[PDB]
Amino acid sequence: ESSFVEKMKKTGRNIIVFYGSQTGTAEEFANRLSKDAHRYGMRGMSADPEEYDLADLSSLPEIDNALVVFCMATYGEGDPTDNAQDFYDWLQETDVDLSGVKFAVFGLGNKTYEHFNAMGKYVDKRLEQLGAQRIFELGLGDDDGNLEEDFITWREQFWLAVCEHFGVEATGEESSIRQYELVVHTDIDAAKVYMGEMGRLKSYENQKPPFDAKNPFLAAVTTNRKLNQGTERHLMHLELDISDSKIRYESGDHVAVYPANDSALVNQLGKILGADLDVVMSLNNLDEESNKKHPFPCPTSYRTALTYYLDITNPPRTNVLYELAQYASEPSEQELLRKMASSSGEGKELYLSWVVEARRHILAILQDCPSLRPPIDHLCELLPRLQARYYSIASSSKVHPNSVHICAVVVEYETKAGRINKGEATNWLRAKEPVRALVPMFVRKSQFRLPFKATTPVIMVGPGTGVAPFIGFIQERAWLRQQGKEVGETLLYYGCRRSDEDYLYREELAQFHRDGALTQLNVAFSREQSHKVYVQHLLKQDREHLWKLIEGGAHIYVCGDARNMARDVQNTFYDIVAELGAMEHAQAVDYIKKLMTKGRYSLDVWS
Ligand SMILES: Cc1cc2nc3c(=O)[nH]c(=O)nc-3n(C[C@H](O)[C@H](O)[C@H](O)COP(=O)(O)OP(=O)(O)OC[C@H]3O[C@@H](n4cnc5c(N)ncnc54)[C@H](O)[C@@H]3O)c2cc1C
Numbered sequence: 001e002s003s004f005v006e007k008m009k010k011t012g013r014n015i016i017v018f019y020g021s022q023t024g025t026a027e028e029f030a031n032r033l034s035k036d037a038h039r040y041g042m043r044g045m046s047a048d049p050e051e052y053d054l055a056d057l058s059s060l061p062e063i064d065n066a067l068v069v070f071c072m073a074t075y076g077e078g079d080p081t082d083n084a085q086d087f088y089d090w091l092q093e094t095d096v097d098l099s100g101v102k103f104a105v106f107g108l109g110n111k112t113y114e115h116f117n118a119m120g121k122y123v124d125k126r127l128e129q130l131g132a133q134r135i136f137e138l139g140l141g142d143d144d145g146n147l148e149e150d151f152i153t154w155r156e157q158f159w160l161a162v163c164e165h166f167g168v169e170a171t172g173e174e175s176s177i178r179q180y181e182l183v184v185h186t187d188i189d190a191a192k193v194y195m196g197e198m199g200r201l202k203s204y205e206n207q208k209p210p211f212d213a214k215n216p217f218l219a220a221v222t223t224n225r226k227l228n229q230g231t232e233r234h235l236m237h238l239e240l241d242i243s244d245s246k247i248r249y250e251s252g253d254h255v256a257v258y259p260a261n262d263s264a265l266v267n268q269l270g271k272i273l274g275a276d277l278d279v280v281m282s283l284n285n286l287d288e289e290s291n292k293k294h295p296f297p298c299p300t301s302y303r304t305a306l307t308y309y310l311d312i313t314n315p316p317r318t319n320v321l322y323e324l325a326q327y328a329s330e331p332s333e334q335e336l337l338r339k340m341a342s343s344s345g346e347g348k349e350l351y352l353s354w355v356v357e358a359r360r361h362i363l364a365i366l367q368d369c370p371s372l373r374p375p376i377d378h379l380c381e382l383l384p385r386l387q388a389r390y391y392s393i394a395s396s397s398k399v400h401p402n403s404v405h406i407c408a409v410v411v412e413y414e415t416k417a418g419r420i421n422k423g424e425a426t427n428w429l430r431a432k433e434p435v436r437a438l439v440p441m442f443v444r445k446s447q448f449r450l451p452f453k454a455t456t457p458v459i460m461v462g463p464g465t466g467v468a469p470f471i472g473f474i475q476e477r478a479w480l481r482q483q484g485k486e487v488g489e490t491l492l493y494y495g496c497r498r499s500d501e502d503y504l505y506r507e508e509l510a511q512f513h514r515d516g517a518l519t520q521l522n523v524a525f526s527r528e529q530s531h532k533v534y535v536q537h538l539l540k541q542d543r544e545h546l547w548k549l550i551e552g553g554a555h556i557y558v559c560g561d562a563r564n565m566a567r568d569v570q571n572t573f574y575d576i577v578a579e580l581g582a583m584e585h586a587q588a589v590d591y592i593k594k595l596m597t598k599g600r601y602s603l604d605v606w607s
Pocket residue numbers: 254313359389390391392393407408409410411412413422423424425426427465468605606607
């Protein structure tokens with residue numbers, strides 16, 4: 001059906017929840033809200049806006065008690081997710097009267113970014129401008145705090161508002177219904193079983209372009225080398241062969257990789273569950289009208305699903321804990337789990353401490369709640385899909401057109417729970433032996449780019465792994481110089497803990513400076529003295545030259561830690577401009593923010 005409104009009429013739904021999602025979180029929130037509808041006598045469905053035409057919103061009044069909800073995540077520079085781009089474009093050009101339309105929006109964002117929840121804010125503002133009626137205030141979910149708690153708090157007030165305005169009431173039947181039913185495929189041909197590939201069956205074996213998120217290219221690991229000294233931490237440089245993939249990229253772009261869960265974790269889950277992981281099965285949607293026939297590719301074995309399709313490392317969200325409680329035979333244990341779904345009080349404190357702060361993954365929860373023995377098929381229905389991880393490409397395609405490089409630090413730490421957590425993708429990449437080893441990947445374009453004019457100077461700030469895109473930038477600027485082009489100054493402000501422990505690309509950067517490609521190599525060693533010495537300290541010391549370059553039209557790039565470094569660096573640039581630019585601090589802020597709008601102050605930061 002082309003019209004979501006007609007689809008709603010045909011299937012008896014009065015609430016439709018659209019999701020703007022890239023890594024599945026918004027989709028899960030939409031699904032959870034859609035299922036809630038029944039608890040109020042209403043009927044809902046979640047939907048991918050890209051599959052429909054949002055202009056049809058003006059027809060919702062044809063359905064009694066119609067309600068439309070939007071769970072939208074914000075991405076690069078405050079833009080919409082790819083699947084919500086058409087909707088965003090429609091909202092920008094339309095002036096249709098949406099009187100009679102009733103809506104609510106929950107935005108997914110992260111305060112460490114420059115444009116916090118920009119998409120949710122825009123959708124909410126626009127719908128009202130068009131004449132639609134807001135049923136409940138805009139939800140501002142913040143992944144830098146705890147997005148789950150923001151969502152459940154908003155969700156509760158949301159339904160109360162729905163009850164008040166539409167005159168409905170809760171049912172109270174927390175029975176919780178399964179969304180999928182299990183079918184064991186005892187006699188299936190081996191060749192018809194998914195073995196970890198995404199999308200089409202056999203797409204990993206039979207690789208045909210175009211390669212993207214739904215059809216990743218299996219790139220061979222040609223290089224995987226340790227960049228630092230000591231068993232302390234592990235920093236590594238990988239080179240992935242993309243020959244014959246037709247994949248294109250530019251320095252500044254991101255490479256996404258689909259990891260495989262640790263087999264030791266998968267094996268232990270199978271044992272504690274008392275399940276034969278090699279059983280091949282299928283989970284089928286009880287809603288025969290939904291386009292989402294299964295929770296992940298199937299038929300497939302439990303081992304395969306728990307290895308390639310499901311997230312078993314991230315601390316579970318509250319709905320998973322609430323639904324599992326019914327399987328805890330011990331009163332105390334079943335009570336602990338049930339409470340964690342509370343938006344406040346003891347229950348919330350326990351969730352944030354026992355699950356989140358303690359970083360307990362599903363196996364840890366099953367282990368620390370020994371009476372919890374849920375059927376493996378229901379667990380597979382509850383666990384979120386395993387998502388790709390993004391890395392800043394550390395190579396220039398002008399120099400390495402057939403290889404995509406990665407600079408990454410392995411995540412590994414002890415939990416207050418006495419366990420050793422290992423980063424999903426980094427522990428997996430670390431184990432990829434060069435020269436056989438394949439990494440399913442794809443490229444995600446970014447707006448982080450070297451200046452159009454080679455003469456334009458660049459100021460690069462990237463401590464730690466934030467140096468990644470800049471290795472590529474320098475390779476390219478060096479290449480331009482080798483092509484006989486006039487290249488402006490190229491400055492790198494890099495930082496590490498100690499010059500003899502975690503100085504990434506020491507030799508390469510030194511050679512680029514000796515070659516003349518890297519005009520300046522400014523490095524801050526943070527722990528080689530009593531007080532911290534960071535990149536911003538070096539920027540402040542270089543205020544005169546930096547102001548000259550900025551005033552001249554230089555481009556600034558900041559990559560790495562978004563939580564504190566990005567903010568501290570930005571604050572230092574404000575000070576440089578306020579001090580030497582002949583203007584007040586507030587004017588300096590406006591000045592730097594304006595550079596961002598002009599593409600002369602770019603960010604590639606993360607957490
Ligand atoms: C646009 C973008 C670009 C990126 N570029 C790079 C890059 O170039 N290089 C790079 O190394 N990474 C980069 N990252 C981070 C990268 O995508 C992954 O998040 C990171 O490699 C960790 O993934 P993982 O699967 O190994 O860890 P996961 O299994 O996902 O675990 C990570 C989580 O573990 C927890 N954690 C980590 N250390 C501790 C600790 N000491 N105590 C308690 N909890 C802890 C945190 O909750 C953290 O969120 C980028 C991210 C984005 C969004």
